């Protein structure tokens, strides 16, 4: 009965000011419901006080509570089940105050 993961909604780029929240979101289908992980710089990201992964059924997000300049870059959303994998990426830009 398996069917592979697919995206209904993919993560979108976001441009934020340093210190502000940054959020990426995806909505994924598949059977069984896919497991979603997020990768940056070749490495799977782990939940902490500054990085969470809110989810509500098919909706899965990534939330930086206070984005730092070192949080900028390409984030990859990887959705997986027995049938297959789906991938989609999005760039986070973080703008630092002048001078």
């Amino acid at each position: 009965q398996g069917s592979p993961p697919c995206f209904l909604r993919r993560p979108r780029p976001v441009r934020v000011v340093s210190g502000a929240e940054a959020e990426l979101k995806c909505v994924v289908l598949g059977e069984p419901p896919p497991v979603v992980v997020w990768e940056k710089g070749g490495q799977q990201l782990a939940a902490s006080e500054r990085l969470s992964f809110p989810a509500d059924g098919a909706e899965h997000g990534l939330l930086l509570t206070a984005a730092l300049p070192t949080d900028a870059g390409v984030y990859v959303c990887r959705a997986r089940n027995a049938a297959g994998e789906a991938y989609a990426a999005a760039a986070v830009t973080v703008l630092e105050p002048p001078a």
Partner: protein, 99 residues
């Protein structure tokens, strides 16, 4: 009304899929007029077909590549290329098949 050269958004640099499973990669873009999408591997255009394991779904700002029942021979460097009347862009993703 301004022409906009094509611009590929974030695309994973490396992805993995187990042999026999389905792989989906989605990537957004901008461009006005809507760019023509070309996926290639080994310098050769990937042709979407109803029958067959390779499928490509293109909209005005998205391309999704699906490879069904992935085989060892499918591994390698895939290039996404966009063209319109005002420019071109390209990016690559390296697809790794696990036995």
């Amino acid at each position: 009304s301004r022409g906009i050269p094509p611009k590929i958004e974030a695309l994973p640099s490396d992805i993995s899929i187990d042999e026999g499973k389905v792989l989906t990669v989605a990537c957004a873009f901008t461009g006005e007029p809507t760019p023509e999408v070309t996926w290639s591997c080994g310098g050769r255009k990937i042709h979407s077909q109803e029958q067959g394991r390779f499928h490509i779904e293109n909209t005005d700002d998205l391309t999704t590549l699906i490879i069904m029942d992935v085989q060892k021979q499918d591994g390698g460097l895939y290039t996404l290329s966009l063209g319109n009347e005002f420019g071109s862009d390209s990016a690559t993703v390296n697809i790794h098949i696990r036995s």
